[PDB]
From Swiss-Prot, chain D:
Positions carrying Phosphoserine: S161, S173
Domain PCI intervals: 29-208
Lineage: superkingdom: Eukaryota
Function: Component of the 26S proteasome, a multiprotein complex involved in the ATP-dependent degradation of ubiquitinated proteins. This complex plays a key role in the maintenance of protein homeostasis by removing misfolded or damaged proteins, which could impair cellular functions, and by removing proteins whose functions are no longer required. Therefore, the proteasome participates in numerous cellular processes, including cell cycle progression, apoptosis, or DNA damage repair.
Protein name per the record: 26S proteasome non-ATPase regulatory subunit 3
Subunit structure: Component of the 19S proteasome regulatory particle complex. The 26S proteasome consists of a 20S core particle (CP) and two 19S regulatory subunits (RP). The regulatory particle is made of a lid composed of 9 subunits including PSMD3, a base containing 6 ATPases and few additional components. Interacts with UBQLN1 (via ubiquitin-like domain). Interacts with ERCC6.
Swiss-Prot record, chain E:
Superkingdom of the organism of origin: Eukaryota
Name of the protein this chain belongs to: 26S proteasome non-ATPase regulatory subunit 11
Induction statement: By FOXO4; expression in embryonic stem cells (ESCs) is mediated by FOXO4.
Similarity remark: Belongs to the proteasome subunit S9 family.
Swiss-Prot record, chain G:
UniProt source species: Homo sapiens
Similarity annotation: Belongs to the AAA ATPase family.
Full protein name: 26S proteasome regulatory subunit 6B
Subunit relationships: Component of the 19S proteasome regulatory particle complex. The 26S proteasome consists of a 20S core particle (CP) and two 19S regulatory subunits (RP). The regulatory particle is made of a lid composed of 9 subunits, a base containing 6 ATPases including PSMC4 and few additional components. Interacts with NR1I3. Interacts with PAAF1. Interacts with TRIM5. Interacts with ZFAND1.
Signal peptide, first to last residue: none
Domain of life: Eukaryota
Gene coding for it: PSMC4
UniProtKB/Swiss-Prot annotation, chain I:
Taxonomic source organism: Homo sapiens
Signal peptide as annotated in the record: none
Annotated PCI domain residues: 1-161
Subunit structure: Component of the 19S proteasome regulatory particle complex. The 26S proteasome consists of a 20S core particle (CP) and two 19S regulatory subunits (RP). The regulatory particle is made of a lid composed of 9 subunits including PSMD6, a base containing 6 ATPases and few additional components.
CC terms in the record's Gene Ontology section: cytosol; extracellular region; ficolin-1-rich granule lumen; nucleoplasm; proteasome accessory complex; proteasome complex; proteasome regulatory particle; secretory granule lumen
Superkingdom, taxonomy of origin: Eukaryota
Family statement: Belongs to the proteasome subunit S10 family.
Record protein name field: 26S proteasome non-ATPase regulatory subunit 6
Amino acid sequence: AVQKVVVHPLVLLSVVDHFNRIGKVGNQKRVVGVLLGSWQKKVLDVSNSFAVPFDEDDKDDSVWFLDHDYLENMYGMFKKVNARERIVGWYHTGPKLHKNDIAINELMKRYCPNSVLVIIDVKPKDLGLPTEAYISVEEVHDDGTPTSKTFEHVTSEIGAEEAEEVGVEHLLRDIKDTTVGTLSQRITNQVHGLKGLNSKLLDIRSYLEKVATGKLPINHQIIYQLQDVFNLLPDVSLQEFVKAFYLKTNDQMVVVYLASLIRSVVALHNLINNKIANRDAEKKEG
Amino acid sequence: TIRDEIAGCIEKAYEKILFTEATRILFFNTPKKMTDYAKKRGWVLGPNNYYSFASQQQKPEDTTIPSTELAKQVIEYARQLEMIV
Amino acid sequence: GIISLLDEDEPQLKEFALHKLNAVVNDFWAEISESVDKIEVLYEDEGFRSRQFAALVASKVFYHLGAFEESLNYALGAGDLFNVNDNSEYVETIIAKCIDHYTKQCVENADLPEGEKKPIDQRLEGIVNKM
Amino acid sequence: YLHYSLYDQAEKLVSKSVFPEQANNNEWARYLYYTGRIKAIQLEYSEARRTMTNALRKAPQHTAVGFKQTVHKLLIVVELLLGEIPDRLQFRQPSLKRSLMPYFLLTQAVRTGNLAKFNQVLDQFGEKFQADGTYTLIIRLRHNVIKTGVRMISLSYSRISLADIAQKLQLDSPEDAEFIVAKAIRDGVIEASINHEKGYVQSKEMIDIYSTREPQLAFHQRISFCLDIHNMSVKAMRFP
Amino acid sequence: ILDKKFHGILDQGEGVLIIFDEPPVDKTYEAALETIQNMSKVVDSLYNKAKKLT
Amino acid sequence: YLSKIEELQLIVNDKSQNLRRLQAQRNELNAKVRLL
Amino acid sequence: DLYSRYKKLQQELEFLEVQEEYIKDEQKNLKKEFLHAQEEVKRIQSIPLVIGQFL
Amino acid sequence: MSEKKQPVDEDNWDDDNVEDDFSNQLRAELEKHGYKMETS
Amino acid sequence: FLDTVSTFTSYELMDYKTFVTYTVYVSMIALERPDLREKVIKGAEILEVLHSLPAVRQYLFSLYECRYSVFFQSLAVVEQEMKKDWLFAPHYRYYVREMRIHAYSQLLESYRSLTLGYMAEAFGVGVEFIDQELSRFIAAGRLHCKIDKVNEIVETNRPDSKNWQYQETIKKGDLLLNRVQKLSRVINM
Amino acid sequence: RPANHRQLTFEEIAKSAKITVNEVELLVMKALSVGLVKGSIDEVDKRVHMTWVQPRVLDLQQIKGMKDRLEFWCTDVKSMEMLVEHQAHDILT
C-alpha cells in the first residue's frame, strides 16, 4: 500500500522544536504529533507537519489523549493555505515502540484510512536513517489468530528537494565536499564491516535467543528463507571459487591496465613542467 | 656433490628411468646407496623401473591473495599521495 | 684470516694474535665482522687476560663499521687500557659519543622523584671530571 | 684495488656505504661502472646488466680518441656472457674498428654456432685478449656458444629430438645433449622432457602466454618505477 | 580464410571452427598513439634542457 | 671537541632550512590562486 | 665561546621543524578551500541557460 | 671530470642486422632454392 | 612514387614503363593486403603499363593468387630481374626473403592444423629444403609460428591485439625517460 | 550436504530418489517446470550443478549448525575485515 517515503528534514526539525517545547515541562513519556503528507504515487512525501498535546499514564496503556478538534482546526488552516498537503500519519520521539501505538494508529486511521508513524531520535548516535515507516495490515497468521493486527515495516529514507539545503549546508559549514580520493571509502569500510556484522552478530544473538528462549513466534517462515537468499553463498572452507579466481583476475585486468598505462602517462605529466620550471627557477633565480 | 646432484637431477625432474641407467650412473649396481637415493627422493620403486611421478600437484594459482595484498600496496601508494601535499 | 688461528687452549697465541692484530689492523677491517661471535666468546672469558684488548679492537672495528654504541659499551668494558688513551681523533669522536650517552642519561634521570635511576656507569662519569 | 688484487671489494661487503645524494653525473656513472665491472668477475649477471647500462648511457661525454668505447668494450663482455646480447651495430667507431677492442667478429661468432672461427678468434687474438685480461670469458663462453646453439634451435622448434640436435651439433651421443638440456631446464630455458625408454627427447612447450597473471604483477615494477620517478621529480622540486 | 577473412580461424577438432573476437581494445591503442608523440615531445624538450644549463 | 663539532653538523642543517623556505614558497603559491 | 652557538641554532632548528611540519598541512587545507571554490564555480550553470550569440 | 682511469687505458651500419643473416648464411640462396625445380 | 600520373616524360627519365616497373617492385611490399589489392589490382592507369610486360602482371597475380610453386616461379622471375638493377643489386637479398616473409605471413596465419608435407607437396621440394629456410625465418625474430618434429603441426599466434602490444610503453619509458632520468640527476653536482 | 559440492552425481539423485539413472534428467527438468530451482542441467558427467532452491524447515540442530557456519562467516569476515582495515589504518591522516 506504501511503496516508500520521500521525507524532507524540515518536518524533522518541526519535530525538534516541539521536543524543545516539551523538554522544559513535566515530560511523562514522549511526543505524539500529527504527520501531514503529500501522497501522490504509492511512494510518499511529507512537506510539513505540526504537533498535538499528549499524556499517558501506564496502568493499562489506554489512557492517552489527543485533541481532534484542534487537530482538524489546524488541518483546515494548513489545508486552506496549502491545498497540496493532507494528513498521512503521526510520529513519536521514543525510539522503541510500545503496545499503545496500535491504539494510536487505528484511532487516527479514521480520517484517512492509512496513518504511517515516524520513529525518530532526538539524541541519535548509533542508528542509520531516523525515518521509519510501518503499516498496519494482516497476514493473519499461520495459526490464523483473531485479528493479529501487525505493524509492517515499510522501507524508508530521507527525501530530497531542490534548494531546501540553502539553510542547511550554509549552517553546518564543516562539510568536506567531494572526498573521493581520500578516506571516505575506509570510513564506509569500518562502518559497514563492523556496524553491519554487529547487526549480524546481534542477529545471531537473537539466534541465541531462539536457543535459550524464543518459543514465541520462533518464525520458521521468513527467517531461514531470506537467510537462504543469503545462503546463495555457503562460504565454507576450501573457499569453493576455483571458478572465480580467473574472474577476479578479469576484475584486476582492466583496472591494472589503466593503472600501468595512465600512471606512466602521469609521471610523463609531472616530469616535463617539473624539470623545465625547476631549472628555470634554479638557474634563473640569480 | 655428484651424488647429491644425482639425488636432485635424475628423478623428480623427469618422467621415468629404468634400473640400468641408475646401474650405470649409480655404481656398485645395488648398494644401499642407490637404494638410499631412490628412497631419498621420497618415492617407492617397482621392479626394474624408477618412475619420477607424483610431482607438481593441483596446478597451483594463488587464488586472490595478490589482489588483496597489492591493494595493500596501493595503501602506501595513497600514502605517497599523502606525503606530497 | 689470521683470526681463526685461536683454537689453542693456551692464551699466548691469543696475545701473539692481538700483537698481529694491532700491527696489520690497517688493511683487514672486514674479517672481524665474521669474528664478532669469537670477540664475544673471548670477551666473556674472565681469567683469559685479553678480553679487554678484544674489547679495544672490537670498538676499533665497530667504529669502522658503524656499531659505535657497542663500541661504546666495549670502551666501557675495555679496562683502564681504554682510559689510558685520550689523545687521538678516534678517542675524541668516541668520548663525544660517550658523554652524548651521559647527557641523554642525565636528562632522562633528572626527572625522577628521588631515585629509581638508570645506572650511570663510573667510566663515563669519571671521564667527565677528567675532561 | 682492481690491478693490485681483490677481496677488498669483499672488504666492502660488511661496510658497504654509498652517498646520501648522488654526486656528479660522470662521477656516479663511472662509480657504477667500477662496481659493475667488479660484479663481472663475481659472475652476478642480474644487477650488473642494469648498472652497466646505467653507467653506459650516463657518461655521454668523452674525448674523440674514445674512452666511451673503452668503457663499452670492457662493459659488454659479460653481457655477451649472458646468453643473449643485442648487436653492437650502434657502437661501432672507426678508430675502434682499427683498434678492434670488443671484436665485432666475436659477437658475430656469438650469433653463429661456429666453433672453428670462434676458437680462431681465441687463439689468433690472444694478443688482444692480453688487453682484455678477462680470460674468465672463454672457459664458459664456449659453453655460451653451445648454449646459444641449443637456445637458437630449441627456441626455433616446437618439438625436437636428440636424434636431430645431439648429432647436428655433434655431441657424439644422446646423453651429452641430455645433460645440456638438463642444465637448460636447470636454467629453465627450455620446457622439454626426455623419453628415457627409446631415445626420444619428447620436448614440448608450456602454455598460457596470455596476459592473465604475469603483466599485472610486472606492473608493480612498472608503477613502482613510475612513482619513484614521481618522488624524484618531487625531490627535484624541493631544491630551489 | 587465407586471402579473405571473417575471423574464421581453423580448428580441426571443434566443429564450429570458432569465430570469436574482441574489436574494441582502443583503450590501449590511443594511449600507445599518445606515448609515440609524447616521447617526441620529451625529445623536443631535451634541446631546451641540454641548452639552458651549459 | 664534543659539542665543538656537534654544533657544526647542526650548522649543516641550515641547508635543511632552504627546503623549509621552499615549502613556505609552496604555501605562498596557491595563496594568490585562492585569493583569485 | 662555543656553548652560546648551539643554544641559538638548536632553538632555530626546532622552531624551523615546527613550522616545516605546519606548512605541509597548511598547503593541504588550501586545496580543500580550493575544492569549495571549484564547486562555487561549477554551480554557476545548472538549471538555467539563456542562449545568446557572441558579437 | 672526464677521465679518472681511462687516459691510461644511409650506409650498411643499419643493414648489419640482416647482414648478420647474409654473411654466415644464404650466400648461394637462389643457387639452391632456384635449383629446387630440377634437383628433385 | 605512387602518384605515377604527372611523371609523364622529362629529360632525366629513362623508360617511363621502367619507372612503372620500379614503382611496382617497391610498392608490392610496404603495402598491406587491402591497400595491396586497391593499388596493384584496382589501379586504373597502372594496368596498361603493366599490360606491356606480361611477367610483371603475372608476378602480381601469382603473388595475390597465393599458390605455393608459382610463388617460386614468380620469385625466380624477380630473382632474374633483381640484380640487373643499379643501387638495387647490392640489395638483392632482403628483398627476396622480404617477398618470402610477406608470402609466408599471409599464408601461415590462416591455418592452424598445418603440416609441412602440405607445404612441400605444392612448393616444389621442401622436405628438408624449406626446413632451414623457415627455421631461419622464425628464429630471425619474425614470422612467429612453431616448427615441429615429425608430429608435424605448425602452430600460429595472436594478431597483437592484446598481448605483444603490452611492451613498447615500458620499452620507451625505460630508455628515453631514463635519458631524462640522467638529466633529472643533473641538479646538484 | 557440505556447502553445495558444485556438481552432484547421478548416483546421488538416483540413490536418494531410489530411481534409475535415466530419470534424474526428467526429474531436474520437472523441477524447472515446478520452478523451485534455476539450475544448469550439468549432465556431461551426469553430475548436476546447483542454484538457489526454495528452502525447508530449519531444525534445532540446523539452527545450531547455521550458527556454526554463519558465525564462521560473520567473525571471519569481521576479523579479516579488521585486518584489512588494520593495514588501511596507516594512511587516514
